[PDB]
From a paper:
The anti-proliferative protein Tob belongs to the Tob/BTG family and plays important roles in cell proliferation, embryonic development, cellular differentiation, cancer suppression, and apoptosis. The anti-proliferative mechanism of Tob was revealed by its complex structure complex with CNOT7 (Caf1), and was further shown to be dependent on CNOT7 or CNOT8 but independent of other CCR4-NOT complex subunits. TobN138 consists of five α-helices and four β-strands that form two anti-parallel β-sheets.
To provide structural insight into fragment binding, crystals of human Tob residues 1–138 (termed TobN138 hereafter), containing Box A and B motifs, were soaked with a buffer containing several fragments. Structures of TobN138 with two inhibitors, corresponding to compounds 1 (i1) and 6 (i6), were determined to 2.3 Å resolution. Lack of sequence conservation in this site together with the low inhibition by i6 suggests it is dispensable for the CNOT7 interaction, but could be useful for design of inhibitors targeting specific Tob/BTG family members. The second inhibitor stacks against the aromatic side chain of Phe97, located on the β2-β3 loop in the Box B motif, and is further stabilized by a hydrogen bond between the O9 atom and the side chain of Glu47, in the Box A motif.
Author numbering: 0 to 115
The structure:
């Protein structure tokens, strides 16, 4: 549910890290990110108001990097700048009941990864 959608979001994000960061530590990155997102999202997931807390759940990498990304970098031995450098600039990822979607660039459109 929430778990599945976190996975599609995770899969999307680390697809940018593979082949430029060490395979094994990227996996660990994925693993930590999943745990931290669950941990954060716990208590803030309302399937009947999909949009409630969405601004909260939003994973954003502007000129500021979302804390869960920083944390997952630390916990995987990965330089936070190497992680940033390999992900799209101005990335937003919205993980909401029934839909995960993302934007790239401040004037980018919103693209949908998963919806049901
Ligand atoms: C996205 C928003 C329109 N929304 C709010 N509650 C929902 C329940 C379902 C469902 O029955 O699967 C689908 C969409 C829903
Ligand atoms: C005003 C600006 C510097 N700023 C400070 N915290 C922020 C968080 C987000 C976010 O999570 O989307 C976006 C912008 C933020
Ligand atoms: Na390695």
């Amino acid at each position: 549910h929430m778990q599945l959608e976190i996975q599609v979001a995770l899969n999307f994000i680390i697809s940018y890290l593979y082949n430029k960061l060490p395979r094994r530590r990227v996996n660990i990155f994925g693993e930590e990110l999943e745990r931290l997102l669950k941990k954060k999202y716990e208590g803030h997931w309302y399937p009947e108001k999909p949009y409630k807390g969405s601004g909260f759940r939003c994973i954003h990498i502007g000129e500021k990097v979302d804390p869960v990304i920083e944390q997952a970098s630390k916990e995987s031995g990965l330089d936070i700048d190497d992680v940033r450098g390999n992900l799209p600039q101005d990335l937003s990822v919205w993980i909401d009941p029934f839909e995960v979607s993302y934007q790239i660039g401040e004037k980018g459109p919103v693209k949908v990864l998963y919806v049901d």
